[PDB]
Amino acid sequence: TTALVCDNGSGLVKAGFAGDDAPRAVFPSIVGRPRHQGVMVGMGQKDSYVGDEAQSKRGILTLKYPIEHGIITNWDDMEKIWHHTFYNELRVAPEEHPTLLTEAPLNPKANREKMTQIMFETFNVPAMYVAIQAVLSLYASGRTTGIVLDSGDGVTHNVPIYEGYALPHAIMRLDLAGRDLTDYLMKILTERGYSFVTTAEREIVRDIKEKLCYVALDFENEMATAASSSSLEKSYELPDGQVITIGNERFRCPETLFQPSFIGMESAGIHETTYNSIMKCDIDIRKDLYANNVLSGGTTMYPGIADRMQKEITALAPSTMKIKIIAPPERKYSVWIGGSILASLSTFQQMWISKQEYDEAGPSIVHRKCF
Amino acid sequence: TTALVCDNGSGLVKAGFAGDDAPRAVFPSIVGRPRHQGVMVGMGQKDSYVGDEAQSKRGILTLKYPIEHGIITNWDDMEKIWHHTFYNELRVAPEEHPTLLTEAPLNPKANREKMTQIMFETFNVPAMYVAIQAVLSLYASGRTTGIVLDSGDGVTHNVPIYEGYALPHAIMRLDLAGRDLTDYLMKILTERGYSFVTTAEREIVRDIKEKLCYVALDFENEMATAASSSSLEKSYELPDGQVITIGNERFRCPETLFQPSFIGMESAGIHETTYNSIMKCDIDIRKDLYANNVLSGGTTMYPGIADRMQKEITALAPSTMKIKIIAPPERKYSVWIGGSILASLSTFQQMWISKQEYDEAGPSIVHRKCF
Amino acid sequence: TTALVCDNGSGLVKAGFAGDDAPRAVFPSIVGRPRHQGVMVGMGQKDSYVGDEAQSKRGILTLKYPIEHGIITNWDDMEKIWHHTFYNELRVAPEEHPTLLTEAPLNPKANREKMTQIMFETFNVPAMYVAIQAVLSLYASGRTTGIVLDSGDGVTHNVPIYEGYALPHAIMRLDLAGRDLTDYLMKILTERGYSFVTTAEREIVRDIKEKLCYVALDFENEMATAASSSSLEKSYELPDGQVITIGNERFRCPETLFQPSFIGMESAGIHETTYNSIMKCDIDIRKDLYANNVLSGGTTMYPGIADRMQKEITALAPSTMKIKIIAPPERKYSVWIGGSILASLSTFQQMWISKQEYDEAGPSIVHRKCF
Amino acid sequence: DEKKSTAFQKKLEPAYQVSKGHKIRLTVELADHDAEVKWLKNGQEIQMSGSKYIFESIGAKRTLTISQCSLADDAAYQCVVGGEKCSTELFVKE
């Protein structure tokens, strides 16, 4: 048989069979109810638009994300996301297919257990597994060691692994991620004059975020440049017209990853929670972690975050120590691709939570010897 | 059974069975009382000439319209219009026939409810319905989307619909329409020398309006042409003689649709209430509305309003956006023809307000789940 | 010297000297051009009626608001509003007078900077200041803490302040306010039969809004009452006659503050953006914010909004937490009165943007250390 | 057992029958609530001829309603989804 490496993600659910390069089904995890009435009779529109079908009908929908910050907050939506994932995007019944889910570190126990209840009871998967979203991005990156920075769309967690042993204590989890950056770019495009309050243009400004934004190498020098020069004023075409010219709001959205004091987050940036995650480890394995710092996640695909990250983490580390960042150009899907390595291993066959192993011990089987 | 798609209209009542191309009974909605005595005895003339019979006896009648601007202002006349519609023009008793009425957007609630009282109590229709006059002109035009401009004889309303969901807030209703244009052409043919004060020649000048008038592509250029050249001075034969030569009063009557400041209407033209109706919608569905702008209604059948409308709505829209106007050559009857689509749907059979559903809940059943 | 606490407002400009109870000059911010010709010669009428002089000549004017939703959209009108404010209403030359302006949160930077250009260049104020319209309504209310709800005529913003420190991130700005409610009451008095399309009767229906409307304590119970009983059908006399009897359209206009789905606004009501503004703050200062919720702004002067607000914000908060709303009966002018506290402070004397401090740094001095 | 109607959840029949000046309706159903059929007729894409051909699509399910059918309308409707066409022969019966 073949195992499906699913991936809940955060705003970009991705799924595909174990044994592929890239996942066969990448679409945003949205569920839209239609707000307006519908005067045309006999149209036969559904009560729930899910997935990429709801990305083409955005101006009529109330788009909702069933995964706010890692956690699933509405299970009746997430069941529709999975049902649309298996039946429409992949067109395979999960009765004869194992399923690899990927859940972030430090989630609630009830989230992982409830996820296992929804997989075994409703979909009747024969054997599913729940794997940690940062370790798979260490499989795909081809490193046995090194702190990995999985800055997802939903949540940003800085897991260290040395010689295949993850360090549980040093794992740092930060709520600030791509969703909150998109909310901050909604906050600072109002500073220019372009209002975005409706969630349907949440997908518009995020697309701005995909194209225009970049992590600047310095901040006060680039704020000294974009306030006087006009070389950074880059325009964008909305889907109706009224092209907008973003100047200093371009490198100011992704800087909130490195200055969480912009949005009132107490913590340090992910250039220092990486350093606090390395200093939390023992003082002899740090040398491989400073060399093997991995970046993954969609939020890490800004142009120039690998140089600003290296500049700040070099400014915090001892200067006699080599700093290297392994960021292959498939940063976004690296959580999936190692999953396609994970379920394809023959030694992983013992790791599946079987249904016979499930019904004997209920939903709390996930935190036992099988993970 | 067969359902009758009636249509109150404004100055042109049209009715026919659901399942036809064109309505079987098209006649003006006039009620004329005879003003003069009648010295011939035994003539046996009626106290009320209604419909097209009162269009042949105009020089003796005081013609009255029971529908001024959408609203029915005199119900004892409108009952005679409907009675003449069923019994003489269509010759079918409405006891064994459902009836689809069409009422404009943003009418009074008492108009729609009182219409339902007159249909169930007096005529005893078994199941009638009241549908919005702009959506049926979206059925007939063969578009699932797009702002529709139903410039009726009585009232002009710019309803947007996206993917079969009408937008209630963006609906713009303008009192200026064909009746008020006919009053303005009565106002500007007095500027040449031909007096029209009697309402019996209200039908004369309207016929001038049907033949001669056209929406000009520019206004100040055509006012610079018709004031010097004589290529626009086109004549017309009244039913007695004294042929009249209309020059610059030809394209100046239908320009009041685009310049409501001619007749003291505060609002913008219907080339800008369309744009304000699109800008009132969300900023992602506008692309289909600029492409799918529908024109319907008798008043939109001027020669060249589809090019002047496209010129002005292109001058107001972002210029990177495609502008197309869907105006099939049955602009006038497009409100009816979609009605012939509407009552012929099998899924519409649940939508009828039955008499058992009426008597349980009184006249306020129309604004409940059945519409 | 004395400082003038000006206040742009939204539909009600108010101005007076620092050191008064109430502002000396309260008038609507309208600019009316006369639409009609004027056959009387030698009348000498002006090309621009501004202020309360244009409230007595409404039936001939095209009244325009230079402030649509917080932003100034037409500066040549707003210069006339200020010029009429200083020279006619207050009769003081601003050469020897500092000027406290009040601008809402989250306005465009170009609005605030352009306002500073108009104040220093044209009027030549020696030292002006721009203060946030919600904090002054916290000075006047006599609270050092607490979320303040400045529901202006133009825009409605829910700023939290704890111990004199405003929270920048938790500030929620909602476009829905008194202007949009007045447009919705124009929308639902057409539902009864009384048409209002001309902007000159924009002031008529707003006066209806001042007298008749009230925020109901429940909605479905009051819609169950006003549909059957007739105790809510209250009449009003227009300035010509034809007294109108508003029934269930009375408490249905101000309910759009609490149901923004009536006018297609996506967001929640201001009974929940207050709760989302408190939940955005830290989880230890919330106790003082639930007790110290301030209401200000003209739109908050409905009879019974302090009880419906407390009912809904009590239904959303934890029920073990005390809910109190501080709403003194000068809700409308509370934005001004704290301004009369603000410019009268001796410690505020360093805060003025001097002209020497202006000309050294241009119009961008406002976002520096002086605010 | 390979039952057809793959993208169809219902295909047209092999033939329908209707009276001249009488209305009928074709019933395809599609296994997808967004899959459309082509409605072709004797190899010609059925377009919604006013009300003489009416695509009522209830969710997935597409239904060609032909009003006041005439011996003109007596012919084959091929509801041709890409890969699945049902050549019903409508029998308008005067």
SS3 for B323-357, per residue?
A: CCEECCCCCCCHHHHHHHHHCCCCHHHHHCEEHHH
Q: Quick check: B293 and B274 in contact, CB under 8 A?
A: yes
Overall size of chain B counted in residues: 371
Residue B156 to residue B174: CA distance in whole angstroms? 5
Backbone dihedral angles phi then psi of residue D73, each to the nearest 5 degrees? -75, -15
Chain A residues whose CB is inside 8 A of the C173 CB are: 190
> Do the chains contact at A44 and D59, CB–CB below 8 Å?
yes
Q: Which two tokens stand for residue C268?
A: 């929640």
C309-313 contacts at long range (C-beta below 8 A, 24 or more positions apart): C309/C149, C309/C215, C309/C270, C309/C271, C309/C274, C311/C217, C312/C258, C312/C269, C312/C271, C312/C272, C313/C271, C313/C274, C313/C275
Q: Which two tokens stand for residue A95?
A: 């009765």
Q: Is the dihedral of CA A56, A62, A66, A71 positive or negative?
A: positive
Question: Nearest by CB to A41, which of B161, B163, B345?
Answer: B345
Q: Which of A153, A243, A165, A260 is nearest to A204 (CA)?
A: A243
DSSP H/E element including B139 = helix B133-139
The CA-based dihedral angle spanning residues D55, D56, D61, D62, taken in that order and rounded to the nearest 10 degrees: -10
Q: Quick check: C70 and C104 in contact, CB under 8 A?
A: yes
Q: Quick check: D29 and D57 in contact, CB under 8 A?
A: no
DSSP H/E element including B132 = strand B127-132
Place of tokens 């699933």: A72
Overall size of chain C counted in residues: 371
Q: Quick check: A366 and A130 in contact, CB under 8 A?
A: yes
Residue C136 to residue A299: CA distance in whole angstroms? 40
DSSP H/E element including C226 = helix C220-226
Burial class (CB in 10 A: 0-12, 13-18, 19+), C369: exposed
Q: Which of C1, C29, C25, C30 is nearest to C15 (CA)?
A: C25
Q: Please count the other Cβ atoms lying within 10 Å of the Cβ belonging to residue B152.
A: 29
Residue B4 to residue B79: CA distance in whole angstroms? 16
Give resolution, Å, one decimal: 6.1
C near B: at least 3 beta-carbon pairs less than 8 Å apart: yes
Q: Quick check: A251 and B327 in contact, CB under 8 A?
A: no
Q: What approach was used to elucidate this structure? A: cryo-EM
Q: Which of B9, B7, B6, B132 is nearest to B70 (CA)?
A: B9
CATH class of segment(s) B178-256? alpha beta
Q: How far is C204 from chain B (nearest CA, A)?
A: 16
Q: Which two tokens stand for residue B120?
A: 């169930």
Residue B213 to residue B193: CA distance in whole angstroms? 18
Q: Which residues pair with C354 in a beta bridge?
A: C127
> Do the chains contact at B266 and C195, CB–CB below 8 Å?
no
What's the distance, Cα to Cα, between the start and end of chain D in Å?
Answer: 40
Q: Quick check: A33 and A61 in contact, CB under 8 A?
A: yes
Q: Which of B283, B308, B285 is nearest to B295 (CA)?
A: B308
D near C: at least 3 beta-carbon pairs less than 8 Å apart: no
Residue B337 to residue D30: CA distance in whole angstroms? 28
Chain D residues whose CB is inside 8 A of the A43 CB are: 57
Q: Please count the other Cβ atoms lying within 10 Å of the Cβ belonging to residue B2.
A: 16
For B340, the closest chain D residue by CA position comes to D51
Q: Which two tokens stand for residue D76?
A: 């084959």
Residue C9 to residue C6: CA distance in whole angstroms? 9
Q: Which two tokens stand for residue C317?
A: 């908060």
Q: Which CATH architecture has domain A4-137+333-360?
A: 2-Layer Sandwich (3.30)
Q: Is C220 helix (H, G, I), strand (E, B) or coil?
A: helix
Residue B142 to residue D7: CA distance in whole angstroms? 25
Q: Is the dihedral of CA A250, A252, A255, A256 positive or negative?
A: negative
Residue C206 to residue A276: CA distance in whole angstroms? 59
Would you give the distance in Å from CA D73 to the centre of its chain?
12
The 3-class SS string of chain A reads CCCEECCCCCCCEEEEECCCCCCCEEECCCEEEECCCCCCCCCCCCCCEEHHHHCCCHHHEEEECCECCCCECCHHHHHHHHHHHHHHHHCCCHHHCCEEEEECCCCCHHHHHHHHHHHHHHHCCCEEEEEEHHHHHHHCCCCCCCCEEEECCCCEEEECEECCEECCCCCCEECCCHHHHHHHHHHHHCCCCCCCCCHHHHHHHHHHHHHCCCCCCCCHHHHHHHCCCCCCCEEECCCCCCCEEECCCCCCCHHHHCCHHHCCCCCCCCCCHHHHHHHCCCCCCHHHHHHCEEEECCCCCCCCHHHHHHHHHHHHCCCCCCCCEECCCCCCCHHHHHHHHHCCCCHHHHHCEEHHHHHHHHHHHCCCCCC
Q: Which of B108, B146, B110, B151 is nearest to B289 (CA)?
A: B146
Residue A308 to residue A219: CA distance in whole angstroms? 10
Residue A47 to residue A59: CA distance in whole angstroms? 16
> Residue A336 to residues A109, A149, A154, D77: CA-CA distances in angstroms?
22, 15, 16, 46
Would you give the distance in Å from CA C115 to the centre of its chain?
18
Question: How crowded is the C-beta side of C309, counted as CA atoms within 13 Å?
Answer: 28
Residue D40 to residue D56: CA distance in whole angstroms? 15
Q: Which residues pair with A5 in a beta bridge?
A: A16, A100
Residue A179 to residue A182: CA distance in whole angstroms? 5
Burial class (CB in 10 A: 0-12, 13-18, 19+), C3: buried
Residue D94 to residue D86: CA distance in whole angstroms? 24
Question: How crowded is the C-beta side of B362, counted as CA atoms within 13 Å?
Answer: 2
Backbone dihedral angles phi then psi of residue C344, each to the nearest 5 degrees? -90, -10
Amino acid found at C39: V
Residue C310 to residue B340: CA distance in whole angstroms? 53
How many H-runs (helices) and E-runs (strands) does chain B carry? Answer: 11, 18
Q: Which two tokens stand for residue C298?
A: 């003209």
Q: Which of C109, C116, C123 is nearest to C81 (CA)?
A: C123
Q: Is C92 helix (H, G, I), strand (E, B) or coil?
A: coil
Residue D37 to residue D62: CA distance in whole angstroms? 7
Q: Please count the other Cβ atoms lying within 10 Å of the Cβ belonging to residue B189.
A: 19
Question: Nearest by CB to A53, which of D34, D60, D61?
Answer: D34
> Do the chains contact at C266 and A198, CB–CB below 8 Å?
yes
Mention every residue, 6+ apart, whose C-beta is less than 8 A from residue C340: C5, C16, C17, C18, C19, C20, C21, C23
Asked if the C-beta of D33 comes within 8 angstroms of chain B's C-beta atoms, the answer is no
B221-227 contacts at long range (C-beta below 8 A, 24 or more positions apart): B222/B248, B222/B251, B223/B248, B226/B250, B226/B251
Question: Nearest by CB to A241, which of B285, B318, B345?
Answer: B318
Q: How far is A181 from chain D (nearest CA, A)?
A: 34
Q: Quick check: D25 and D51 in contact, CB under 8 A?
A: no
Mention every residue, 6+ apart, whose C-beta is less than 8 A from residue A26: A12, A13, A14, A333
Residue C99 to residue C129: CA distance in whole angstroms? 6
Cα angle: B307, vertex B312, B318; to 5 degrees = 120
Question: How crowded is the C-beta side of B25, counted as CA atoms within 13 Å?
Answer: 27
For C188, the closest chain B residue by CA position comes to B106
- Report the neighbours of C using a cutoff of 3 or more CB pairs below 8 angstroms: A, B
Place of tokens 């250039």: A271
Place of tokens 């036809």: B20
Pairing of strands A49-50, B165-166: unpaired
Q: Is C214 helix (H, G, I), strand (E, B) or coil?
A: coil
For A204, the closest chain B residue by CA position comes to B284
Burial class (CB in 10 A: 0-12, 13-18, 19+), C283: exposed
Beta strands in C133-233 (DSSP E): 148-151, 156-159, 161-162, 165-166, 173-174
Amino acid found at B138: L
Asked if the C-beta of C200 comes within 8 angstroms of chain B's C-beta atoms, the answer is yes
Q: Is B266 helix (H, G, I), strand (E, B) or coil?
A: coil
Q: Which two tokens stand for residue D87?
A: 């050549």
For B286, the closest chain A residue by CA position comes to A240
Asked if the C-beta of B167 comes within 8 angstroms of chain C's C-beta atoms, the answer is yes
Q: Please count the other Cβ atoms lying within 10 Å of the Cβ belonging to residue A360.
A: 9
Backbone dihedral angles phi then psi of residue B330, each to the nearest 5 degrees? -100, 60
Q: Quick check: A172 and A273 in contact, CB under 8 A?
A: yes
Residue C61 to residue A175: CA distance in whole angstroms? 55
Q: Quick check: B201 and B63 in contact, CB under 8 A?
A: no
Amino acid found at C41: V
> Residue A177 to residues A74, A147, B198, C105, C277: CA-CA distances in angstroms?
20, 18, 75, 26, 21
Q: Please count the other Cβ atoms lying within 10 Å of the Cβ belonging to residue C271.
A: 21
Q: Which residues pair with B25 in a beta bridge?
A: B15
Mention every residue, 6+ apart, whose C-beta is less than 8 A from residue A136: A102, A334, A335, A336, A337, A338, A339, A341, A342
Asked if the C-beta of C106 comes within 8 angstroms of chain A's C-beta atoms, the answer is yes
Quick one: residue B19, left, alpha or beta (phi over 0 = left, psi -120 to 50 = alpha)?
A: left
> Residue A95 to residues A86, A119, D31: CA-CA distances in angstroms?
11, 11, 19
Q: Which of C206, C276, C267, C273 is nearest to C10 (CA)?
A: C206
DSSP H/E element including B162 = strand B161-162
Backbone dihedral angles phi then psi of residue A196, each to the nearest 5 degrees? -140, 100
Residue A261 to residue A268: CA distance in whole angstroms? 8
DSSP C367: T
Residue D22 to residue B1: CA distance in whole angstroms? 11
The overall longest dimension of chain B from CA atoms, in Å, is 73
DSSP H/E element including D61 = strand D61-69
Chain D residues whose CB is inside 8 A of the B345 CB are: 54, 56, 65
What's the distance, Cα to Cα, between the start and end of chain C in Å?
Answer: 21
Q: Is D59 helix (H, G, I), strand (E, B) or coil?
A: coil
Residue C53 to residue C32: CA distance in whole angstroms? 10
Overall size of chain D counted in residues: 94
Asked if the C-beta of B104 comes within 8 angstroms of chain C's C-beta atoms, the answer is no
> Do the chains contact at C197 and B267, CB–CB below 8 Å?
yes
DSSP H/E element including C189 = helix C178-189
Q: Is the dihedral of CA C249, C255, C261, C266 positive or negative?
A: positive
Residue D50 to residue D63: CA distance in whole angstroms? 15
Would you give the distance in Å from CA C320 to the centre of its chain?
33
> Do the chains contact at A192 and C108, CB–CB below 8 Å?
yes
C near A: at least 3 beta-carbon pairs less than 8 Å apart: yes
Q: Is C116 helix (H, G, I), strand (E, B) or coil?
A: helix
What's the distance, Cα to Cα, between the start and end of chain A in Å?
Answer: 21
Q: Please count the other Cβ atoms lying within 10 Å of the Cβ belonging to residue A361.
A: 12
Question: How crowded is the C-beta side of C196, counted as CA atoms within 13 Å?
Answer: 24
Task: Extract the annotated binding site of C.
Answer: 10, 14, 153, 209, 298, 301, 332
> Do the chains contact at A201 and B345, CB–CB below 8 Å?
no
- Report the neighbours of A using a cutoff of 3 or more CB pairs below 8 angstroms: B, C, D
Asked if the C-beta of B348 comes within 8 angstroms of chain A's C-beta atoms, the answer is yes
Mention every residue, 6+ apart, whose C-beta is less than 8 A from residue A147: A158, A159, A160, A161, A274, A277, A278, A289, A292, A293, A294
Chain C residues whose CB is inside 8 A of the A263 CB are: 169
Backbone dihedral angles phi then psi of residue A204, each to the nearest 5 degrees? -75, -55
Q: Which of C177, C176, C175, C166 is nearest to C280 (CA)?
A: C166
Q: Which two tokens stand for residue C164?
A: 């004199």
Asked if the C-beta of D34 comes within 8 angstroms of chain A's C-beta atoms, the answer is yes
Q: b/e for B342-360, b at 16 or more Cβ within 10 A?
A: bbbbeebeebbbbeeebee
